[PDB]
Scaffold this active site. Structure first.
Site, PDB file in Angstrom:
ATOM      1  N   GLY C 241      53.361  16.660  44.146  1.00 25.49           N
ATOM      2  CA  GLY C 241      53.818  15.874  45.289  1.00 25.49           C
ATOM      3  C   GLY C 241      53.184  14.499  45.312  1.00 25.49           C
ATOM      4  O   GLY C 241      53.873  13.475  45.244  1.00 25.49           O
ATOM      5  N   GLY C 469      49.345  22.541  43.667  1.00 26.36           N
ATOM      6  CA  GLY C 469      48.503  22.350  42.487  1.00 26.36           C
ATOM      7  C   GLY C 469      47.040  22.087  42.828  1.00 26.36           C
ATOM      8  O   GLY C 469      46.197  21.923  41.934  1.00 26.36           O
ATOM      9  N   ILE C 616      31.515  21.870  47.911  1.00 28.19           N
ATOM     10  CA  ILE C 616      32.627  22.178  47.020  1.00 28.19           C
ATOM     11  C   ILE C 616      32.965  23.664  47.104  1.00 28.19           C
ATOM     12  O   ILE C 616      32.153  24.530  46.773  1.00 28.19           O
ATOM     13  CB  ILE C 616      32.322  21.799  45.550  1.00 28.19           C
ATOM     14  CG1 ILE C 616      31.965  20.306  45.435  1.00 28.19           C
ATOM     15  CG2 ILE C 616      33.520  22.116  44.648  1.00 28.19           C
ATOM     16  CD1 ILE C 616      33.056  19.358  45.900  1.00 28.19           C
ATOM     17  N   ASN C 618      35.399  25.296  45.422  1.00 29.18           N
ATOM     18  CA  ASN C 618      35.648  25.848  44.079  1.00 29.18           C
ATOM     19  C   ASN C 618      35.455  24.774  43.014  1.00 29.18           C
ATOM     20  O   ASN C 618      36.346  23.957  42.789  1.00 29.18           O
ATOM     21  CB  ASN C 618      37.052  26.475  43.978  1.00 29.18           C
ATOM     22  CG  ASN C 618      37.294  27.170  42.640  1.00 29.18           C
ATOM     23  OD1 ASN C 618      36.931  26.650  41.597  1.00 29.18           O
ATOM     24  ND2 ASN C 618      37.917  28.353  42.666  1.00 29.18           N
ATOM     25  N   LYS C 620      35.690  24.600  39.871  1.00 22.95           N
ATOM     26  CA  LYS C 620      36.629  24.557  38.773  1.00 22.95           C
ATOM     27  C   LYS C 620      37.899  23.790  39.175  1.00 22.95           C
ATOM     28  O   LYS C 620      38.274  22.784  38.545  1.00 22.95           O
ATOM     29  CB  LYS C 620      36.965  25.989  38.353  1.00 22.95           C
ATOM     30  CG  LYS C 620      37.622  26.108  36.994  1.00 22.95           C
ATOM     31  CD  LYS C 620      38.088  27.531  36.783  1.00 22.95           C
ATOM     32  CE  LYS C 620      38.051  27.898  35.328  1.00 22.95           C
ATOM     33  NZ  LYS C 620      38.112  29.373  35.237  1.00 22.95           N
ATOM     34  N   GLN C 625      41.083  18.618  40.176  1.00 21.61           N
ATOM     35  CA  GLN C 625      41.538  17.561  41.035  1.00 21.61           C
ATOM     36  C   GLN C 625      41.079  16.199  40.548  1.00 21.61           C
ATOM     37  O   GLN C 625      41.872  15.262  40.460  1.00 21.61           O
ATOM     38  CB  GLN C 625      41.024  17.746  42.460  1.00 21.61           C
ATOM     39  CG  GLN C 625      41.775  18.783  43.244  1.00 21.61           C
ATOM     40  CD  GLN C 625      43.219  18.390  43.450  1.00 21.61           C
ATOM     41  OE1 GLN C 625      43.515  17.566  44.299  1.00 21.61           O
ATOM     42  NE2 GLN C 625      44.122  18.986  42.677  1.00 21.61           N
ATOM     43  N   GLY C 689      37.158  16.345  51.729  1.00 17.60           N
ATOM     44  CA  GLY C 689      38.197  16.234  50.688  1.00 17.60           C
ATOM     45  C   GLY C 689      37.777  15.667  49.340  1.00 17.60           C
ATOM     46  O   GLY C 689      36.831  14.857  49.258  1.00 17.60           O
ATOM     47  N   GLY C 691      40.771  15.560  46.659  1.00 14.26           N
ATOM     48  CA  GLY C 691      42.021  15.303  45.989  1.00 14.26           C
ATOM     49  C   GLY C 691      42.500  13.863  45.915  1.00 14.26           C
ATOM     50  O   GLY C 691      43.195  13.538  44.962  1.00 14.26           O
ATOM     51  N   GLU C 692      42.139  13.029  46.908  1.00 13.13           N
ATOM     52  CA  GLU C 692      42.460  11.597  46.923  1.00 13.13           C
ATOM     53  C   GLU C 692      41.263  10.691  46.553  1.00 13.13           C
ATOM     54  O   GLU C 692      41.436   9.647  45.904  1.00 13.13           O
ATOM     55  CB  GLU C 692      43.001  11.192  48.301  1.00 13.13           C
ATOM     56  CG  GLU C 692      44.414  11.672  48.588  1.00 13.13           C
ATOM     57  CD  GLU C 692      44.955  11.184  49.925  1.00 13.13           C
ATOM     58  OE1 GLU C 692      44.186  11.214  50.909  1.00 13.13           O
ATOM     59  OE2 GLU C 692      46.165  10.804  49.990  1.00 13.13           O
TER      60      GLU C 692
HETATM   61  N1  LIG Z   1      35.296  20.574  49.169  1.00 12.40           N
HETATM   62  C1  LIG Z   1      36.327  21.177  48.779  1.00 12.40           C
HETATM   63  C2  LIG Z   1      37.517  20.125  48.768  1.00 12.40           C
HETATM   64  C3  LIG Z   1      38.679  20.436  47.984  1.00 12.40           C
HETATM   65  N2  LIG Z   1      38.630  21.250  46.925  1.00 12.40           N
HETATM   66  C4  LIG Z   1      39.579  21.361  45.844  1.00 12.40           C
HETATM   67  O1  LIG Z   1      40.584  20.583  45.800  1.00 12.40           O
HETATM   68  C5  LIG Z   1      41.840  20.784  46.478  1.00 12.40           C
HETATM   69  C6  LIG Z   1      41.889  19.781  47.277  1.00 12.40           C
HETATM   70  O2  LIG Z   1      41.804  19.934  48.516  1.00 12.40           O
HETATM   71  P1  LIG Z   1      41.703  18.636  49.326  1.00 12.40           P
HETATM   72  O3  LIG Z   1      40.970  17.410  48.612  1.00 12.40           O
HETATM   73  O4  LIG Z   1      41.692  19.030  50.877  1.00 12.40           O
HETATM   74  O5  LIG Z   1      43.335  18.028  49.320  1.00 12.40           O
HETATM   75  P2  LIG Z   1      44.595  18.734  50.002  1.00 12.40           P
HETATM   76  O6  LIG Z   1      44.357  20.232  50.171  1.00 12.40           O
HETATM   77  O7  LIG Z   1      44.598  18.239  51.270  1.00 12.40           O
HETATM   78  O8  LIG Z   1      45.876  18.420  49.056  1.00 12.40           O
HETATM   79  C7  LIG Z   1      46.390  16.966  49.129  1.00 12.40           C
HETATM   80  C8  LIG Z   1      45.882  16.144  48.390  1.00 12.40           C
HETATM   81  O9  LIG Z   1      46.062  16.668  46.905  1.00 12.40           O
HETATM   82  C9  LIG Z   1      45.848  15.812  45.687  1.00 12.40           C
HETATM   83  N3  LIG Z   1      46.094  16.418  44.540  1.00 12.40           N
HETATM   84  C10 LIG Z   1      47.077  17.045  44.221  1.00 12.40           C
HETATM   85  N4  LIG Z   1      47.145  17.683  42.930  1.00 12.40           N
HETATM   86  C11 LIG Z   1      48.298  18.523  42.775  1.00 12.40           C
HETATM   87  N5  LIG Z   1      48.180  18.948  41.369  1.00 12.40           N
HETATM   88  N6  LIG Z   1      49.565  17.951  43.016  1.00 12.40           N
HETATM   89  C12 LIG Z   1      49.565  17.149  44.166  1.00 12.40           C
HETATM   90  O10 LIG Z   1      50.653  16.796  44.625  1.00 12.40           O
HETATM   91  C13 LIG Z   1      48.538  16.155  44.714  1.00 12.40           C
HETATM   92  N7  LIG Z   1      48.418  15.558  45.906  1.00 12.40           N
HETATM   93  C14 LIG Z   1      46.876  14.533  46.050  1.00 12.40           C
HETATM   94  C15 LIG Z   1      46.963  14.205  47.523  1.00 12.40           C
HETATM   95  S1  LIG Z   1      48.466  12.716  47.545  1.00 12.40           S
HETATM   96  C16 LIG Z   1      46.605  14.574  48.354  1.00 12.40           C
HETATM   97  S2  LIG Z   1      46.609  14.137  50.022  1.00 12.40           S
HETATM   98  C17 LIG Z   1      41.406  22.453  46.839  1.00 12.40           C
HETATM   99  O11 LIG Z   1      42.639  23.040  47.001  1.00 12.40           O
HETATM  100  C18 LIG Z   1      40.443  22.932  45.874  1.00 12.40           C
HETATM  101  O12 LIG Z   1      40.758  23.315  44.698  1.00 12.40           O
HETATM  102  C19 LIG Z   1      37.451  22.390  46.858  1.00 12.40           C
HETATM  103  O13 LIG Z   1      37.223  22.824  45.934  1.00 12.40           O
HETATM  104  N8  LIG Z   1      36.173  21.386  47.367  1.00 12.40           N
HETATM  105  O1  MOS Z   2      47.945  11.763  51.868  1.00 11.65           O
HETATM  106 MO1  MOS Z   2      48.034  12.214  49.916  1.00 11.65          MO
HETATM  107  O2  MOS Z   2      49.368  13.371  50.252  1.00 11.65           O
HETATM  108  S1  MOS Z   2      49.319  10.270  49.598  1.00 11.65           S
HETATM  109 CL   LIG Z   3      33.669  24.549  36.134  1.00  6.51          CL
END
Ligand SMILES: Nc1ccn([C@@H]2O[C@H](COP(=O)(O)OP(=O)(O)OC[C@H]3Oc4nc5nc(N)nc(O)c5nc4C(S)=C3S)[C@@H](O)[C@H]2O)c(=O)n1
Ligand code: MOS
Ligand SMILES: [Cl-]
Ligand SMILES: Cc1cc2nc3c(=O)[nH]c(=O)nc-3n(C[C@H](O)[C@H](O)[C@H](O)COP(=O)(O)OP(=O)(O)OC[C@H]3O[C@@H](n4cnc5c(N)ncnc54)[C@H](O)[C@@H]3O)c2cc1C
Ligand code: SF4
Ligand code: FES
Ligand code: FES
Ligand SMILES: [Cl-]
Ligand SMILES: [Cl-]
Ligand SMILES: [Cl-]
Ligand SMILES: [Cl-]
Ligand SMILES: [Cl-]
Ligand SMILES: [Cl-]
Ligand SMILES: [Cl-]
Ligand SMILES: [Cl-]
Ligand SMILES: [Cl-]
Lengths: 173, 316, 730
Positions: C241, C469, C616, C618, C620, C625, C689, C691-692
């Protein structure tokens, strides 16, 4: 003003060991035959134009992009998809390596990665050179540089690449 | 994609005969360009004739001490062939520098020569493109032209031929072998095979209605150092910005052909003879006639610097 | 559960299963082709018809007529859906551009019809016969041309001014004044947007590919003008996404409309060539930075203005917010300027605002550091701010930017770098090293979950949260397993269905933290319900090895459910802690690059990210990410651009070939280090977070590496070889 009616033709494919007998529109790609006609949805459609490799399958052991070949072109062919390699309770070694190394995130490129990677190891064994093969006359080695190039036709927007490489090197040794 | 009838035949002679008898008929090989274009209805044949499995897929030594490469040989198999790797290395390098493993497995010798431009205005059927619709205009001329041709162009079209294998064929003095639907044969030197755009960019090659390429013949090996340098924005799975094919002998003489710069592989025999004098002299002859846009001007300096890099590789 | 005071000790702190690098639990499904995406639900509608889209052939104007007779008459065709025959629609709150155009055309490839047919092939061929008729209107397509006319902010987004920027800039010993551009970028999620619709009377079920289930249901209902309770959204597996599936797109609308008109299931996939202009894109930016520092290298003045463009009422790219918080400076100016452009809708892409903002800011810092005579790592450490620079009384909950950088530099061997650019070769390649800071805020949102202890001792998690993902399935399972004292493999997790409790969704990188905190809240209630079934006090009870213990007393979880299964449903809600403290996340990005000394080709040789993002959950899937985001950052830096035609008003290179994203061959070694950043002000999970964040700074680190390799600053991304060629050696 108009577009012509489907031309329908009988078709025999061998898919994952199984004899299938179909009647297909001549336009139907191997990709759509698997997903829509046979309901083998493991093979994915990322672009439909040969640009991504998400529809990678094996046809008589050779990897190709199923979106850029017609079903009727492979009358009597042996097709192998991701479903043919293994399933959840009997994972292929590559499928298992991918889980171990986290060689996927969204999972949409992953079928294609896996089919390509199995065929890539075969191509190296068969001595087929690549863009990064330094000495063209001698046999290529299973290096990280070689795998990367040979896999560059499978696109991962998730960017799981580094982990995909680790999975393949694991399964290879 | 428009519906079409699909024909398998027994001989290559039958394939060409059917192409004359059936208006709108086309041959399909790997399908890796034709099906792409057909999905978008840029090509709209009413009839497909499968030319795989007709014995046109052998690589053979010719009686002259060269190589006859069948039209239907796969690109992977051509590049992997032992004779080609030792004796025609630049062909193997150019093949391997292009496309992906999946694509190279299905793409064929003839198909590759006949692949059409990747011009993005051409691919978009809502945009003006003289190649696809004569007189409608060339959107690329004053639009996004970064990856278009700088030499051999016209006002009407500035498209590049995308083939890497064709750049290497041109360097080797390759000859396209055909059969006409009439049943007679023709040899077209690859240097005379691609027409310039002029005022008819929709006309692309010397093939007639339903003419079937059966093989490509190479002459005897040249020896020397064979190199294929392909420049692109990412490391793999992309067409050339500029590509230099070279065959350099021990005394500094040789030949070169370029891709990414014109509607065909670009090689001038006067320029080959100036290799020993350096990249500057070779470039000046190669690009005397250049007519870039502002967006693709960089290709000229890229060509010269890439060529200099290639010659320096050969010294080492 | 209301979370309005910092978390103390709680069961997550044991970290028996939370915090550990577990294999993702959807792995067996995703590696065997048995995970079902939107277009692949055959059993749920085995006679489903195929819907094929017709996009606008013009950028802007009126649709004067739309002819459908030839298409209606074509082989296997059931219907053609159009704005005329579909009836009056509403518009969802997250759609700027209408999803079905006509009579107004707002952008290029805006959907204007859908041909429904018996087969895919018949629908596509039939779609080519749909004949649209247009009257063009004058549009604006060039952000740089619209720049000059825009010098006020939007009414609802005034500039932010602290101290006296202009004074401090004048007085500063050393300073820069530089302009940066970023282009329009595209998501290129490998799964095309698809949906399948089934109507049962007034009830709609939509299988789709969407990051935000509840937003989807609400907006689809508002658009169709149906009760929200009549709509059900289903999206358990999403093939990427990256922000591009946060909202209702035209596949979902048109599938729904088609399926009601033909009284039969219909599935619709947006073809790949149509996606970049039909959907959304990261807006291009144009950014003006002016930064001043004193004799000692302390930043005294910072000004960051950013210009972006969008359709009327569309969002700006929020490229200046990071500059309000990341570095110290008593005198500050930030401002957005929003042009009106008639391109497709600009909207969120991975790290909206921060990715482009840091793309500019972190080169500017590199430049100013160079001018001050100070190592760029030390320059950033010197200008760390542990409080809000606009409100010194307001602390960061937890800020480890210094530690990220030092750790990074030590691991990377930053001291090996040659500070004078252009002096290191490896064969024909110029080798360079560069560094950049990452920054991203931690957002909180309400999130719910339902959790069941089953009679066979297994645990069932239901929530409408998505796994795009990211690994939500897996971390949610870890959360419940941790709270209830069961092993991971005994937890079922069911996601992405609107019949489950409302979560915050996958967006804003709030998803991991919010969704696991909802599960925490349900599991706390469930522990309480379990304690009560075996006559124990919840406060004094512990949960381990499939048992509940309470001092000397001890029961098994089998016994708690002997009298039927136990079900708890709860939400976490967030109070004023994100006002009281500034909650953010930080990183250090270290890159080595190679630049070919002849051709100018750039190849990344080595990348390290050091991140601080709470606990964190997870390591892995978290590492994944970040290497993913590093890869996306490489694309933004070197190859990704949506080429605008100023004359025709669209993105020219609108497909998977023309829009170059990174391939296997591009990828170097990529290392990730997570600092232990446990933040109890964030939530009971203590997570934030990644992922971003993982994308933030990456591109500028690379740009700063190219500079160190070549001596050539490039301030217009992407840094392609043509921009380097005339300044290289010979
Ligand atoms: N402290 C915590 C924070 C998160 N995570 C890891 O990372 C993911 C991320 O969670 P988080 O940073 O909260 O992000 P979101 O759940 O909110 O997912 C959205 C976020 O996800 C990212 N990465 C993604 N990667 C997948 N492959 N495809 C997407 O569209 C992407 N979208 C980006 C974007 S745009 C955005 S906003 C968890 O599911 C987990 O594996 C965990 O291990 N450590
Ligand atoms: O807020 Mo991330 O899904 S552009
Ligand atoms: Cl690892
Ligand atoms: C994503 C992608 C990336 C690519 N990258 C590269 C690259 O980097 N470098 C490069 O060179 N190429 C690249 N290609 C192109 C590829 O090399 C060609 O598509 C392929 O060579 C075509 O061969 P084919 O056999 O599939 O031809 P087909 O698609 O089968 O046919 C093409 C044309 O030839 C005709 N034809 C076929 N056989 C014969 C015959 N015997 N006689 C007469 N006519 C015939 C057809 O009617 C048609 O017009 C790429 C393609 C894709 C999809
Ligand atoms: S360049 Fe040739 S192909 Fe590209 S648009 Fe102009 S004419 Fe059509
Ligand atoms: S779907 Fe076949 S390559 Fe993308
Ligand atoms: S795993 Fe999401 S595309 Fe490769
Ligand atoms: Cl294997
Ligand atoms: Cl013309
Ligand atoms: Cl030079
Ligand atoms: Cl573990
Ligand atoms: Cl106009
Ligand atoms: Cl420290
Ligand atoms: Cl406990
Ligand atoms: Cl770990
Ligand atoms: Cl392009």
């Amino acid at each position: 003003a108009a577009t012509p009616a489907p031309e329908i033709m009988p078709l025999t494919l061998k898919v994952n060991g199984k004899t299938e007998q179909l009647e297909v529109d001549t336009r139907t790609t191997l990709l759509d035959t698997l997903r829509e006609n046979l309901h083998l949805i493991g093979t994915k459609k990322g672009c439909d134009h040969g640009q991504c490799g998400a529809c990678t399958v094996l046809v008589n052991g050779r990897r190709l992009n199923a979106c850029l070949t017609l079903a009727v072109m492979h009358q009597g062919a042996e097709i192998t998809t991701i479903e043919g390699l293994g399933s959840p309770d009997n994972l292929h070694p590559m499928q298992a390596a991918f889980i171990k190394h986290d060689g996927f995130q969204c999972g949409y490129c992953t079928s294609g990665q896996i089919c390509s990677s199995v065929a890539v190891l075969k191509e190296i064994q068969d001595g087929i050179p690549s863009h990064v093969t330094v000495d063209l006359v001698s046999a290529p080695e299973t290096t990280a540089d070689e795998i990367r190039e040979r896999m560059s036709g499978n696109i991962c927007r998730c960017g799981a690449y580094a982990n995909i490489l680790a999975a393949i090197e694991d399964a290879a040794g | 994609m428009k519906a079409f009838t699909y024909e398998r035949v027994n001989t290559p002679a039958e394939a060409a005969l059917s192409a004359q008898r059936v208006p709108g008929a086309k041959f399909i090989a790997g399908g890796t360009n034709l099906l792409d274009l057909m999905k978008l209805e840029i090509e709209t044949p009413t009839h497909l004739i499968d030319v795989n499995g007709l014995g046109l897929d052998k690589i053979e030594v010719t009686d002259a001490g060269g190589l006859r490469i069948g039209a239907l040989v796969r690109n992977t198999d051509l590049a992997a062939h032992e004779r080609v790797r030792r004796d025609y290395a630049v062909l193997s390098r150019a093949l391997l520098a292009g496309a992906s493993g999946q694509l190279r497995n299905q793409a064929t010798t003839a198909g590759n020569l006949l692949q059409r431009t990747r011009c993005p205005y051409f691919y978009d059927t809502n945009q003006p493109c003289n190649k696809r619709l004569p007189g409608s205009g060339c959107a690329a001329l004053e639009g996004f032209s970064r990856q278009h041709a700088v030499v051999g162009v016209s006002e009407a079209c500035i498209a590049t031929h995308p083939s890497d294998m064709a750049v290497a064929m041109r360097l080797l003095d390759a000859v396209v072998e055909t059969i006409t639907p009439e049943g007679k044969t023709r040899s077209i030197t690859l240097a005379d095979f691609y027409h310039p755009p002029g005022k008819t960019p929709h006309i692309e090659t010397a093939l007639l209605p339903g003419e079937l390429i059966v093989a490509v013949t190479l002459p005897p090996p040249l020896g020397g150092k064979h190199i294929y340098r392909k420049v692109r924005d990412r490391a793999s799975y992309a067409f050339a910005l500029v590509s230099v094919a070279a065959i350099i002998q021990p005394d500094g003489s040789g030949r070169v052909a370029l891709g990414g710069v014109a509607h065909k592989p670009w090689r001038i025999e006067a320029a080959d003879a100036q290799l020993s004098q350096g990249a500057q002299a070779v470039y000046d002859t190669l690009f005397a006639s250049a007519h870039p846009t502002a967006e693709n001007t960089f290709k000229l300096l890229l060509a010269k610097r890439t060529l200099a890099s290639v010659l320096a590789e050969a010294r080492a | 559960m209301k979370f309005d005071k910092p978390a103390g000790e709680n069961p997550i702190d044991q970290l028996k299963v939370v915090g550990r690098p577990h294999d993702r639990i959807d792995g067996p499904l995703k590696t065997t082709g048995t995970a079902r995406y939107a277009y692949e639900w055959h059993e749920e509608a085995p006679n489903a018809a195929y819907g094929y889209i017709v996009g606008s052939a013009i950028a802007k104007g009126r649709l004067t007529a739309l002819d459908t007779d030839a298409a209606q008459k074509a082989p296997g065709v059931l219907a053609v859906i159009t704005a005329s025959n579909a009836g009056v629609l509403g518009k969802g709150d997250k759609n700027t551009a209408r999803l079905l155009g006509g009579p107004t055309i707002e952008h290029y490839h805006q959907a204007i019809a859908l041909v429904v047919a018996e087969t895919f092939e018949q629908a596509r061929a039939a779609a080519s016969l749909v004949q649209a008729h247009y009257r063009r209107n004058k549009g604006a397509y060039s952000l740089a041309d619209e720049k000059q006319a825009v010098n006020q902010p939007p009414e609802d987004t005034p500039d932010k001014n602290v101290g006296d920027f202009d004074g401090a800039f004048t007085s500063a010993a050393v300073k820069i004044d530089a302009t940066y551009t970023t282009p329009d970028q595209s998501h290129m999620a490998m799964e095309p947007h698809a949906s399948m619709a089934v109507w049962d009377g007034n009830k709609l079920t939509l299988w789709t590919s969407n990051q935000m289930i509840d937003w989807c249901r609400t907006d689809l209902a508002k658009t169709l003008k149906v009760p929200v309770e009549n709509v059900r959204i289903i999206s358990p597996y999403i093939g990427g996404g990256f922000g591009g599936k946060l909202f209702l797109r035209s596949d979902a609308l048109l599938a729904a409309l088609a399926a009601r008109a033909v009284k039969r299931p219909v599935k619709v996939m947006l073809p790949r060539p149509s996606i970049p202009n039909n959907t959304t894109h990261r807006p291009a930016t144009l950014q003006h930075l002016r930064i001043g520092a004193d004799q000692s290298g302390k930043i005294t003045a910072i000004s960051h203005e950013s210009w972006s463009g969008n359709l009327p009422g569309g969002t700006p790219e929020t490229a200046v917010q990071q500059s309000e918080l990341l570095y110290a400076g008593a005198n500050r100016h930030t401002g957005l300027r929003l042009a009106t452009l008639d391109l497709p809708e600009g909207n969120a892409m991975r790290a909206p605002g921060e990715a482009p903002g840091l793309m500019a800011l972190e080169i500017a810092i590199d430049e100013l550091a160079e001018k001050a005579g100070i190592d760029p790592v030390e320059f950033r450490i010197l200008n760390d701010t542990q409080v809000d620079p606009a409100g010194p009384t307001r602390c960061f909950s937890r800020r480890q930017l210094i530690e990220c950088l030092r750790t990074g530099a030590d691991k990377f061997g930053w001291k090996q770098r040659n500070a004078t650019p252009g002096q290191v070769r490896d064969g024909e390649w110029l080798v360079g090293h560069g560094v950049a800071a990452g920054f991203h805020n931690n957002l909180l949102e309400k999130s719910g979950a339902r959790v069941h202890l089953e009679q066979n001792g297994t645990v069932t998690v239901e929530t409408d949260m998505t796994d795009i993902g990211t690994g939500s399935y897996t971390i949610l399972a870890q959360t419940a397993a941790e709270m209830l004292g069961v092993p991971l493999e005994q937890v079922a997790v069911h996601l992405g269905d609107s019949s489950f409790p409302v979560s915050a969704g996958s967006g804003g990188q709030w998803g991991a933290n919010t969704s696991t905190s909802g599960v925490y809240a349900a599991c706390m209630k469930l522990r309480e319900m379990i304690a009560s079934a075996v006559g124990f006090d919840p406060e004094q009870s512990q949960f381990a090895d499939g048992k509940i213990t309470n001092g000397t007393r001890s029961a098994t979880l089998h016994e708690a459910t002997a009298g039927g299964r136990l079900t708890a449903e709860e939400s976490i809600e967030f109070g004023t802690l994100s006002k009281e403290y500034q909650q953010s996340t930080f990183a250090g990005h270290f890159v080595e690059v190679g630049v070919h000394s002849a051709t100018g080709e750039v190849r990344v040789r080595r990348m390290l990210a050091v991140c601080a993002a709470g606990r964190i959950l997870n390591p892995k899937t978290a590492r994944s990410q970040v290497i993913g985001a590093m890869t996306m950052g490489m694309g933004a830096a070197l190859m990704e651009e949506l080429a605008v035609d100023d004359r025709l008003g669209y993105f020219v290179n609108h497909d998977m070939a023309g829009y170059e994203v990174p391939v296997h061959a591009d990828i170097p070694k990529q290392e990730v280090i997570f600092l232990d950043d446990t933040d109890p002000i964030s939530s009971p999970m203590k997570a934030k977070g990644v992922g971003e964040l993982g994308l933030c700074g990456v591109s500028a680190a690379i740009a700063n590496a190219v500079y160190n390799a070549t001596g050539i600053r490039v301030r217009d991304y992407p840094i392609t070889l043509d921009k380097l060629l005339d300044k290289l050696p010979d």
